[PDB]
Amino acid sequence: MKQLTILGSTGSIGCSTLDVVRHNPEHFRVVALVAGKNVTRMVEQCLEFSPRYAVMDDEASAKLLKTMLQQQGSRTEVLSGQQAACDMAALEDVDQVMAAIVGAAGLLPTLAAIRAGKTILLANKESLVTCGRLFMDAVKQSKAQLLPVDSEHNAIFQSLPQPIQHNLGYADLEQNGVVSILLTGSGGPFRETPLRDLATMTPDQACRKISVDSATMMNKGLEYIEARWLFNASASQMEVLIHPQSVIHSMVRYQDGSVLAQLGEPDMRTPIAHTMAWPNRVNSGVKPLDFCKLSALTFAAPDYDRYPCLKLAMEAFEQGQAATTALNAANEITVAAFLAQQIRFTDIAALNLSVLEKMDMREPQCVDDVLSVDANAREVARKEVMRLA
Template sequence: MRRVKSEPKVISILGATGSVGQSSLDIVSSSPERYRINALSAHNSVEGLAQAALSCGAEFAAIGDVRAYSKLKEFLAGSDIEIAAGEDGLLEAASRNCDIVIGSIVGAAGIRPTMAALQAGNQVALANKEALVCAGDLIMAEAKRQRLRILPVDSEHNAIFQIFDETSIEEIEEVTITASGGPFRTWPQEEIEKATAVQALKHPNWDMGAKITIDSASMMNKGLEVIEAHHLYDVPQSKFNVVVHPQSIIHGMVSYSDGSVLAHLAAPDMRTPIAHCLAWPERAAANTKRLNLVELGQMTFEAPDPVRFPCLRLALEAMGEGGNLPNIMNAANEVAVAAFLKGEIAFGGIPKLVEAVMSKMAEQGRLPVSSLDLVLELDEMARIYARELLSELTILEV
């Protein structure tokens, strides 16, 4: 049954001031007859959150950093917008009654809000891949219990979502996730290891936040995406394939036993998968960038290089081991990326630190993902080890 058009979908956006959040607000503002905003959240971008809440008529705004609460209160004084702060505020934003929660909080901080949204019975459009990387078994079990479909916002997972035939899973031979190759695709290994943050942040195709841009440059992002896709589509690791596709036009492919390969093509514009998730199970017109194959001219493909990009190898190894090792790997990577952006380690230090933490916590990594408390406990333990190892390993810049 089609949705009555006089009843707009109610949307909450977690991480409203980031790139996905801003693209989501753009989609919503261009179709006020289809969507309205209930809640918005941000980590510490107070002014951006306040401006977004006022401009879209949000009912609720939550700032993750409790120190920013008074400033948010100042910005929203005189409005009818309810405000909150800290983790409790984020969980309330996720739990408020709505049709879709867009989960675009960066990193492991998005795990609890994602779970809270599902437990409240809200549909989740997920852009926070760490929620599934770290706690995929728990998140997917809760979605199943609530009879909710997790809608994938990442362009690659959304592409697969649109071409994945769930009625013929046994006939699927391979699921291919494409990668742009990032800014260092053609660089020699020694130059990659010495790359600066300015160089790593120059992504050739996508405009993203700093964390995901660095992950793209190291190809850790692609490893995280394979783990996420494994949980979303219940496909074994042996059936996943990563292909470097510099033009970022084909976002995903599914190969079937009869020799057919279905591919999803779109211009590299995050508003396309966001618009698809917001309108699902319908489709709706959106002011997104259109693909022109004639102008494009050609598309090229190559295999990823696990030697020059060891983060991809580490992520796939963690996936193969299972348990809490992907969670531990992710925490170490978040610490390593933050250290790199601060100039504390070289780019080549990121995989070295991640591998060292994975090795040190191998025993804990074998523990099953049995509870959210355990996931977050091991996440914090991995961060502590990673910070300690920063001063022990010979990866500091000189």
């Protein structure tokens, strides 16, 4: 009977998890829930699963919720603030912790779950891009079990050998017959748009923020950074590959030539159920992949001239977490600029490049250091945007 704490229970990943806990009440139980300001959906969840605790971003949302729960007669104790969350991630009787809260708001709570040696269902890939060294070091000491929920990373994990799975982040690929890890990506919507046509591409053509990252492939570059930390992989053990149909979520290449891959519907309940029942399986309610109703599957090598963000990310890794933390921040600024129609589509990569170019510093050593680089990065970015508008 696995008892958990969900960090970010109101967003989509948070609800999908609850979907799995719903149809598998014999395997899971929710002890605590942590959300931001959506008191509404929280009450709903506090009434269904009735955990022991519930945490909100502030006292306002907490007082409001507390009251609504009073009316329904929910025994659920309500708390608020960042510390509360971390205390929920570290709860003594909690087995697994779904880290679904993204952004800086998720760092401490996730790190706390790690330092307590809990099984971590990592649904906030972001963190490894900024706190890669810290988190991975903290895993080593506490021996916490990281379990990537992200679709591509969930697939790489399902394709790795057992001894590497039970010692994620601090295991030798090489020594276990792993030659390299194959990170796959659709290639974005401008995959075939002739080069001298990217500058004219508009937001409507790229169709929220991820779409853009998919278009520039900054998204794959970030997953590139996350992978190297998560699986302790060198640049020579990584492969980025374009796969448009996206049936194959990602693959792993072995010494004897075998390649292992994970396929399935795009539904997030599959990779979410996988990590929750590991090393076993449960029903996620996801539709069985129909191999007869699929687009032919194809592959192609990414072109750096078409995807400058991939190169930048790969270079930023060799430059340190200061560079990755800054590459991430700046990107959120330029992308946003692109959507508000303040820069050309092609300026995303150019401005993300400048920020880094014009940014000296030193490797962080803790969350606060990371937040500091993030702050400067955005600044230098906002300033760069203006320099073009």
